[PDB]
Amino acid sequence: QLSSVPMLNVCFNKLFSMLQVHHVQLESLLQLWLTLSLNSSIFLYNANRIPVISLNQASIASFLTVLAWYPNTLLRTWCLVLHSLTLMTNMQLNQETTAHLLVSDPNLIHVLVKFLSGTSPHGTNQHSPQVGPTATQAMQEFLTRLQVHLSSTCPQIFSELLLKLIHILSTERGAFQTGQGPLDAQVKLLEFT
Amino acid sequence: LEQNFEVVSVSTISAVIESVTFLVHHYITCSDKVMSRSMTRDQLMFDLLKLVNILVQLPLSSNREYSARVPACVADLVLANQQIMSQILSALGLCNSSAMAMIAISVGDGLFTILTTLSKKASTVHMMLQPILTYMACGYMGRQGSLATCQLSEPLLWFILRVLDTSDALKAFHDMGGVQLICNNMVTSTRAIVNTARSMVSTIMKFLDGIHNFAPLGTITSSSPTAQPAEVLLQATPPHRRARSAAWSYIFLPEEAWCDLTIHLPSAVLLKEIHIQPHLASLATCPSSVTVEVSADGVNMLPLSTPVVTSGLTYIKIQLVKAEVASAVCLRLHRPRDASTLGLSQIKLLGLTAFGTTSSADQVSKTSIGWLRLLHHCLTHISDLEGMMASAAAPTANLLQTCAALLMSPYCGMHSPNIEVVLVKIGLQSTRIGLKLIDILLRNCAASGSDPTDLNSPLLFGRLNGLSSDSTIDILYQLGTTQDPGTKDRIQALLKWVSDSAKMAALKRSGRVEYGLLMPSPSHLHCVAAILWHSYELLVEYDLPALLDRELFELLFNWSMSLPCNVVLKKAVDSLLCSMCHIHPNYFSLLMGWMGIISLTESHLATLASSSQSPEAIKQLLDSGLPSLLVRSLASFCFSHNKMPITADLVAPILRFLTEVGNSHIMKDWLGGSEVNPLWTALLFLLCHSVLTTQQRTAIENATVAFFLQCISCHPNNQKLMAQVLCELFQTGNISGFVRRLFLQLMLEDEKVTMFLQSPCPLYKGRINATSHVIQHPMFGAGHKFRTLHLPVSTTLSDVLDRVSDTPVPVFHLFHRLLAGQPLPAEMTLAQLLTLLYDRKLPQGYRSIDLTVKLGLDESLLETCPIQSPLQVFAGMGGLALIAERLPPIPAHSLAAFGLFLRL
Amino acid sequence: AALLTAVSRQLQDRLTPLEALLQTRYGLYSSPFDPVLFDLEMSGSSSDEIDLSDVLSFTSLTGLLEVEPLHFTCVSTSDGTRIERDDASHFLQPPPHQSIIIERMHSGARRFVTLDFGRPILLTDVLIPTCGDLASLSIDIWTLGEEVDGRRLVVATDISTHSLILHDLIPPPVCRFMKITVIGRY
Amino acid sequence: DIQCRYNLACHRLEALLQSIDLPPLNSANNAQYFLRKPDKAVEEDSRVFSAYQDCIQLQLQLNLAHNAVQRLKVAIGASRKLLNETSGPEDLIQTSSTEQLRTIVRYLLDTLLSLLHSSNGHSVPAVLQSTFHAQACEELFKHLCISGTPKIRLHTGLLLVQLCGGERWWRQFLSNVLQELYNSEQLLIFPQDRVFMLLSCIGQRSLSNSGVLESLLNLLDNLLSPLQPGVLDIPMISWVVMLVSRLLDYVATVEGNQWSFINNNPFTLAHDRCISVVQKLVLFLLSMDFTCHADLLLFVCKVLARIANATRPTIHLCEIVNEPQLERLLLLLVGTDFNRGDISWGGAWAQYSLTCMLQDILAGELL
C-alpha cells in the first residue's frame, strides 16, 4: 500500500552522500540508478523521462565533485554520467531547477573539460582518440536538455558556460591546441554552440 | 638506467619516487575494460620501476640533504613516506598472478623487485613492518568499522612471506599485533565474501539438462535498409582461406561513417571475448576502428570502451578484462581508410552461460584464504615462536568457526592439510580452545554471536552441523592422541558427545547443537573408538578406564541393538563397543550377561562378532563356549539335511558371524581345531553338490565360500587341512556347480592379506575430495598417518609404497617391528614377506601385516621362497590328479591333453 | 487397487541396499543378484530414464522367454541389397544386429535380401522396426523346396509409419529360409 | 554351466559393490565430487558397468535355458506348476519373483490408468475417495517410486495425480513427501534428482490449484523460521526453492524473459500468506556468507521476484525489506565492502540477478 519511492530516495541520497568517501563505486551506482529509473519509467532509454528516484542538491553536488577529481574516468563510465545527468535535468527538486543547479555549479565545466580532453591516458592498448557515435549522441542530448530546460529561465548562463568551455579548451595547454581528446565530441559541441 | 646517481640531492630523488609511484599506481589501477592484441607503455612503466629500484639502492650521506659521495639509505625515506608505500602496496594488490608469473618483464615484477629491495635495504625490520601493518589495518581507503579488508593478491602475499621469513620479523610482527589483525581481517572478509563454488545447485541443473560461441543462436540485425541480412556471419563454420568473396559486404554512403551490426542473443550470457574476422583476400575492406556495444537488458546498449583501431589486421580479437552479461551485442564499424566497402568474413561471440553444460571451462584476492596462509606461515615457520603466535591468535572471537568453514569449503587456493595443521595448533594451545574446537566439529558449528539483525557481526549459517570429512577425522584424532595437559578433558568431551548422541537416538526412538547429537557421523564414532584404542595402547598418563562409564556402555549396546545390521552407524557403535571391551574385560562379560549366554538374531550375532574382535573378548568368547555351541548345532543341522535348534534362516548369519570372529588369529587356530573339523565336511554334505530353497542355497553357498576363504587366509596348516578335506571329497562323477565355486574362488584366486601401515609423515594419495564412511577396526586407527590396504600376496612392496603415497633425495623406506632397524626391499612380494614373518615370531594367519613407513639381507629376502598357495598344498597332496579324473583362441586338444597330463 | 497395494508392499520388501545403490548411482534398476527373471519385452531396440519434459507436456513383443534368439547367416544370394552387421549355448547368446545397406536406392522399385537359419525351426516371433524410408514390405518363407513348400508370412504396406510386429504365430510354421522384399516410397 | 558362470559374476559384482562408497550430497564437497567426476571414480564405474553387463546377460541366458528346460519337461509329459486354492493369497505374493511383482504392478497401473480414462464421465466411483486416502497414497507413492524402475514410478505418479488431484490434502501430501524424502536427517538411499523431476511434473499436473504452491511456500517459510530471529540447512531449502522456481516457470509457460539466464535454454496467491515467505527470503539474501553461495542467491532472487509479481496485490518494496536492510542490499549491489575493483560480489551473475530482482519488484509496484 505504501509507496516505496521515498525510501528509495532516502537510501539513494545516502549512497550519493557516501560517494565522496569512496564507500560506493561511482559507475555501478550510476548503472543501478539508471536501470531502476528506466524500468519504473518501458525498458528503452528516453530523454523525455522523469526518474522515479529523486536526488537532493547535496547528492548532485557530491556527484559533480567526485567527477571533478575522478582519475582516468573510463568512457562508458562517462556515458553513464551523461545519461544520468540528462535524467537529473529531467528530475524535479523540492525554488531552483536541477539544470540551473548543474550549470551554476563550478564543477560541471571541469567535468566537461575532463570528458572532452579524456583521450586514452592509460595507453595500455592502441585505441582511437574518437569516442564513437554513442558518446557523441549522449553529449548532444545532454546539452540539448540543458538548452530546453534553461531557455525559459536563463539561457545566458548556459551560453556563457558553453563559451567558457570553448575558452578553456582553446587556450594554451588545452585539448584544442595539443590535439588530445575526441574529435567527434568537440566537433559536435562546436556545432551545438 | 645506464647512468649512476651519486651526489644527486635527496629531494629530487623523493619527488621522482613519489611521482613515478603515483603514475605506476594510476596505470595499474586504471585500465581499459577491452584489451586487444595483434615500444610499449608497459616497457615505459617497467623502466620507470627499474629507475626507482636503482634510486632506492643509493647510499645516503650523513647530512641527509644529498646522497652519499662515496647504514642510512634512500630506502629509509621511502619507508618513512606513507603515501608512496601505500600506493606501492595497493598497486601490487591490484596486480594479478598472471602478470607476476613471468617473475621480470611486467610491472608486477617491478613492484615486487622494488619491495624486495626495500626489505633488504631497510635499516631496521620494524621500519619495513610498519607500512605493511598500516596497509592491513587501513583496508581499501583507510576504512574501519565495516566489513572492509585490504585486497591481498598472491604477489603481495609472497612479499609478506619474504618479509616474515626471518625470526626477528616474526617477533616484531607479534609485537606490532599483526596476528590479531590477520585473524580479525580473516573473520570480516569471510563474512563479507560469498563463495562462488558451483555447489549442489549446479549438480541438479547439470542432471536436469574453454568458452563457447553463441553467435549461431543469435540473430543479426542492421539498421541500414540497404544492408544485407548478414546471417552468414553468425555461422559457426569459419570461411575458408582465399575465398576471394566477402561473406557480407556493406556499401558506404559518403555521409555515413559508422555501420552498425546488432546481434540479439536468445538469453543473457556472460561475455568474455568477441572475434571479428575481416576478409582475408582484401584487407582494404577491413574496418579502420571497431567499438563494441553490449546490453544486459538487450535494448539499452551500454558499450565497453573506446574504439579499437583495427587497420591492417587479418583477425580482430577483442577480449574483455571483466566478463559482463550481455543479452544483445551491437558492433559499430567505421568506414575503411581507403576502400568504400566493408568486408567481414565471420563474427564470433565467445562466452559462457550459467546453469548448463556450457557453464564450464586470483583466488587469493577473491576469497579470504590468504589471511589464513599468513597465519599458517606465522604458526608453522618457526617452532620456537609457535606457542606465542598461538597465544596471539587465541583471544580472537569466531576464529575457530571461520577456520572450520574454510577447512570444509572447496579448494580456494590453499590445501586442506595445512588448514588442518592450523586447526590442530590452535586447539592444542589451550584446553578451552580444544574443547571449543571439539564443540565446533561435533555438536554446534555456528558463530558465537549469531546475530542476523546486526548485519556486521560474522555469522556461520549455511554449514551443515555435525558434518564430517577426513580432515575433521584428522583433527579429532590429533586432538585425542596428543599428550599435552588438558587431554583428559578432550577425551571426556568426546565421550560426552557419544553419550549425548546415544541419548538423542533413544529420544528419537521414543518419539518425543541438537542436530549434531541427532545425526552422528559413523566416521567420527570410529575416530573416537580409534582414539580410545590407541590411547589404551600408548599407556597414557590419564586413566582411560576411569573415563569410560558402564551406563554409557549400556546406552551404546541399546543403540547398537536398535539399529539394523546393514547400517554403517551400527558398525561404528560396534567399533566403540569393541574399544570399550578391549579396555574393560568386564564389559564383555556384562555384554554376554545381556545376551543371556551362560534366541540369537542377526544383529545380536553382528554385535557379538564386532565386540569380540578384540583378543581378550576372543578368549572370553572361546571360554564361554558359544562358538562351540554354534559349531555343534550347525553340524547337527548339516547332518539332518546340549544341542541347540538352528532355523534355516539363521544359518547364513551364523556363517557370517564365524567369518567375522575368525578374522582373529586365535580363532583361526580354533577353526583348525578338532571340534570344527567335522563342520567343513558337514557343510559340504549339507550343500550336497546338487530341503533348502534356491535363494537360501545360493546365500549359504556364498557364505560357505567366504567362511572357508576366511579360514584358509594365509594359514598354512588350515589350507593343508582344507586340502585333505577336499581331496577326500574328490576321492569319494563330474564336477558340480558348488564344487567349482569352491575350487575356483577358494583355490585359484590368489590369497589376499590385510595390511596396516604406520607412518609419522601423513600420506595423502589415498584420500579423495569427498566424505565417506569406511568402518574399520580400531587397531588400524584413523587419519592420514594410518593406511590400510587389502592387497594380494603377489603384489610387490614397491606397488604398496606407490599406492600409499606418490613419492615422486629422501626416499620412504618400509620397516617392520620384527625386522627392527632393517630396511625392506621394494622388489619382494607380500608372499615372501609372509614366509619370512611366519619364520619369525609373527603367528600364522595374523589379522594384518604391520609395516612402518619412515623417510630415509634384502637379497636374502629375495631368495626366500613365497608362501605356498592353497593350490600348491592341494596339488602337493595329489588332489589335482583327482580333479583331473573327475572332470568331464587356445586349441581344445591342448586343454584335453593338459588334463590328461594332470592325471599323470 | 487392492492387489496393486499388496504387491507394492511386497515389492518394497524385496529391495536390497546394494540394488538401491546401483539405482541411485548408476541408474541400473534391474536386479542382478536375483537369478530368476519373469518376463522380457522388446518394442524398440538399436542408465535408462524417460524424458519427463517431452512425454509429459506402441506395441511390444511379450513373452520372449520360452522362445530362443536365433543366429542367422545370409548364405543365400540377395539381389539389390547386401547384408552387413552393425558394429544350444551359441543360440542362447543374442544375435548381432545386421542392418541392411543399399548401395543405391531408387524410388518405386523392388529390392530384397535373403537369409538362412541353416536348420529347420519353428518361428513364432517377428519384430521389424518401422522405417519411414520404405513404402511396402513383404516376407516369404520356405523349407525343402524354394517354391514347393514356400509360403508368404505377411504383406506389410504399413512399414512407413507402423512397425511390422508378430506377437505369436498360432500355427507355428517350419522355416529354414526367408526373403524380405522391400519397396521404397514413391 | 550358465548358472555357475552367473554365480561367479554375481560374486565378483558383490565384492565390487562392497568396494564402492557414495556421498549423500549433504555438502558442496560431495557436489564438487559429482561435478568433477574423478578418474578413479570413472574406472570404478567402468568396472561396475562391465560386471553388471556380464551379470544381466548371464542372468538372461540362465532364464532362457531354464524356461527351455521347463518346455522340454512339458514335452516329456510333466505338467507345469499348478496353482493351489488351499494356499493363501499372501504367501502366493510372497513366494513370487521380484520381476513378477514388477510386471504385475506395471500391468495393474496400465489397467487403472484405463479405468480413470472412462467414457462414463471420466470418474471412478470408489477409488477416488474411499480406497485412496492420504496415508495409502503416501505409502504406495513411496514403495513404488523409491524402489521402482522409472517407467513404473512415472505410471504410479500419474495415477496418483488422477486419483488425488481433487482431494484437498494433495498440497500437504506434496509438501510432506518433499520434506521427509529430501531431509538431511533422512538416510534413505534413493536417486534424489529423478524423484525431483517427478516431483516437478506431479506439481505441474496439479498446478491449476494454487494450494500446492501455497503449501510449498508455507513449508519454505517454516524452514526459514530460524533465520528471522534453530538450525538451518542449505540443501533441502535449496530443493524447496528449486521446486517453487520450476513451478513458477511452468506457470509462466502456460500463461522475453527476465529470468531466462537461469533457465538452461486463478493462480494469483494472496498477499498475507506470501509476505512472510518473501521477507524470510530477503533475510536469507542478506544473510549469505562464505558458507553460502551466490548459486542459491540466483534462485532466491528469481523466486522472490516471481512471488512478488505473482500476488494479486503486488508486493511493494516498503514491506519486503527494512530501510537499513535496503541500504545493506544496495551495499551488496554497489560499494567497496562487497565488490572491490575487478572482483564482483558473487560474480557478475549475482549482481545481474539482484538488479533484475529490484527491477521486477519496482515494475510490479509501478504497473
Numbering used by the authors:
A (entry chain A): 2618 to 2658, 2669 to 2721, 2731 to 2829
B (entry chain B): 2830 to 2867, 2899 to 2930, 2963 to 2995, 3015 to 3120, 3145 to 3296, 3307 to 3457, 3468 to 3553, 3590 to 3632, ...
C (entry chain A): 1448 to 1493, 1506 to 1516, 1531 to 1560, 1752 to 1850
D (entry chain A): 1909 to 2137, 2147 to 2172, 2184 to 2193, 2306 to 2407
The article reads:
The gigantic Inhibitor-of-Apoptosis Protein BIRC6/BRUCE/Apollon inhibits both apoptosis and autophagy by promoting ubiquitylation of proapoptotic factors and the key autophagic protein LC3, respectively. Although BIRC6 is a gigantic 530 kDa protein, only two small domains, i.e., the 8 kDa BIR domain and the 19 kDa UBC domain, were previously annotated.
The central section of BIRC6 is responsible for dimer interactions mediated by an armadillo-repeat domain (ArmRD), which is composed of 31 armadillo repeats (ArmR). The major component of the N-terminal region is a WD40 repeat (WDR)30 β-propeller domain. There is a long insertion between the second and the third blades of the WDR, which folds into two structural domains, BIR and a tightly associated domain. This domain mediates the indirect interaction between BIR and WDR and thus termed BIR-stabilizing domain (BSD) hereafter. All the three domains, WDR, BSD and BIR, interact with the JRL1 domain, orienting the BIR domain toward the center of the U-shape structure. This anti-parallel arrangement of two monomers would bring close the two sets of functional domains (such as BIR and UBC), suggesting that BIRC6 dimer could work either in cis or in trans to fulfill its role in substrate ubiquitylation.
